[PDB]
Every structure is written in structure tokens, then in C-alpha cells.
Amino acid sequence: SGTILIDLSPDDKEFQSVEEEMQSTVREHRDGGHAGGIFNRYNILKIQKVCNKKLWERYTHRRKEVSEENHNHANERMLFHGSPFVNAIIHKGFDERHAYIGGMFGAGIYFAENSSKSNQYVYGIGGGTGCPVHKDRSCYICHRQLLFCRVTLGKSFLQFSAMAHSPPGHHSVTGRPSVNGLALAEYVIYRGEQAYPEYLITYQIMRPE
Ligand SMILES: NS(=O)(=O)Cc1ccc(-c2nc3ccccc3c(=O)[nH]2)cc1
Numbered sequence: 493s494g495t496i497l498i499d500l501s502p503d504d505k506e507f508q509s510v511e512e513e514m515q516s517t518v519r520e521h522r523d524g525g526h527a528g529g530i531f532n533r534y535n536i537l538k539i540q541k542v543c544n545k546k547l548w549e550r551y552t553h554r555r556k557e558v559s560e561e562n563h564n565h566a567n568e569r570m571l572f573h574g575s576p577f578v579n580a581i582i583h584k585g586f587d588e589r590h591a592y593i594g595g596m597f598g599a600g601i602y603f604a605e606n607s608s609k610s611n612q613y614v615y616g617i618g619g620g621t622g623c624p625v626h627k628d629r630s631c632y633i634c635h636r637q638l639l640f641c642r643v644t645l646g647k648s649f650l651q652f653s654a655m656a657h658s659p660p661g662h663h664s665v666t667g668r669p670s671v672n673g674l675a676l677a678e679y680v681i682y683r684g685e686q687a688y689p690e691y692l693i694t695y696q697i698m699r700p701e
């Protein structure tokens with residue numbers, strides 16, 4: 493594949509800032525925990541930097557294209573992605589196989605500001621049948637993985653709300669929450685080259701006291 497994973501020390505500022513983004517963007521979900529489990533915080537077990545020259549150059553090439561189409565503004569974010577295919581993504585990159593075909597903004601690749609939103613997809617859409625070992629969507633034992641990804645949004649189409657093409661004249665879609673005042677935005681891209689899987693985070697959800 494060309495992918496190397498470099499472990500970050502918990503003493504490293506980079507580990508600490510990624511962990512803080514993970515922990516601080518947990519929220520409660522309208523499903524009461526059905527899909528992703530019941531928790532307020534995680535036990536972070538490992539954070540690895542994902543290093544792949546080809547995939548990075550694929551990303552920066554597309555980033556430049558988007559920037560040049562948007563007054564030299566890539567509108568780059570760091571966003572979470574959860575998927576049963578995390579280990580394929582880090583080796584091969586994002587592509588049409590990683591799209592949410594039934595997503596509310598069409599068939600594209602979905603990312604979240606709330607880590608807990610991406611956690612709902614670690615075992616599949618709706619949490620699937622939960623962890624493979626115990627069949628438990630709220631498993632507190634099994635190790636989960638999320639990606640913290642560098643994403644190029646460019647000019648993003650704003651959708652107020654409660655693989656396809658991006659809307660004409662746009663590079664992405666932003667799903668803005670219109671009902672749940674505590675929810676953060678979600679984003680969709682329609683080209684795998686617009687995201688790079690920068691950090692692989694291994695964690696457990698923690699049972700509340
Ligand atoms: N196509 S598939 O076979 O890879 C199944 C799949 C479906 C949905 C996701 C997914 N949906 C989201 C929706 C909103 C916000 C964040 C996410 C996210 O991180 N992942 C991941 C994988």
C-alpha cells in the first residue's frame with residue numbers, strides 16, 4: 493500500500509490536541525445511544541499518524557485544483573470519519589466504495605465535527621449489529637477506530653436540515669443542524685481525493701458513572 497503508521501506518544505502535543513478534539517466534540521444523540529452506545533467520553537488507547545506519499549500527493553493535487561477554483565481558498569477542515577472500512581481507507585485512500593449511498597445529501601463521503609456522530613458508523617449504518625465479538629452497539633470492551641481527516645470543502649453548498657456529483661458550482665455540501673441546537677455540522681464530499689486520513693484513533697467508549 494505504501495502506508496506507514498507512526499505511533500504518537502501521549503506526551504506529544506499532537507497526541508494531546510487530537511485527543512482534545514475527540515473528547516470535546518462528544519454530544520448526546522437523538523437515538524438515546526442506540527447506534528453508537530451510551531457514553532460521555534472515551535478511553536483513548538492509541539493515536540497513529542497515517543503516512544502515505546501517494547495518497548498525500550493525490551490529496552494536495554486536488555486541494556490545489558479546488559483552491560484555484562475558489563479564490564485561493566481550499567476551505568480545509570479537520571473532521572471525523574467512522575466506517576467499517578477504516579483499515580481499507582488508510583491503505584488505499586477514500587473512494588466511491590466508502591460513500592454513504594443512502595445519506596441525506598446523496599451518495600458521497602460523509603464527515604462530522606462531532607466525534608460521537610462518526611462513532612455511530614464504526615460498526616456500520618445505524619451501528620449495524622454492534623461489535624463483532626459481543627453484538628453490542630454500546631460495547632465498552634471492544635476497541636473501536638475513527639479517522640481524523642483533513643478535508644477540502646472548497647465552496648460548500650449550505651443545506652439547512654433537521655457516487656453523486658456535488659451541486660453545480662460547489663465542491664461539497666454542508667449539513668447544518670436546524671432542530672438540535674447542540675449538534676455540530678456534517679459535511680459531504682463527492683471525490684475521494686478531497687480527504688486525507690491523517691490520524692487513526694483507537695479507543696473505547698466509557699460507561700458513565
Ligand atoms: N458507504 S459505506 O459502505 O462505507 C458505509 C458507511 C456509511 C456511512 C458512514 C458515515 N456516515 C456519516 C454521516 C454523517 C457524519 C459522519 C459520517 C461518518 O463518519 N461515516 C461511513 C460508512
Ligand SMILES: [Zn+2]
Nearest residue numbers: 623626631634
Ligand atoms: Zn464487544
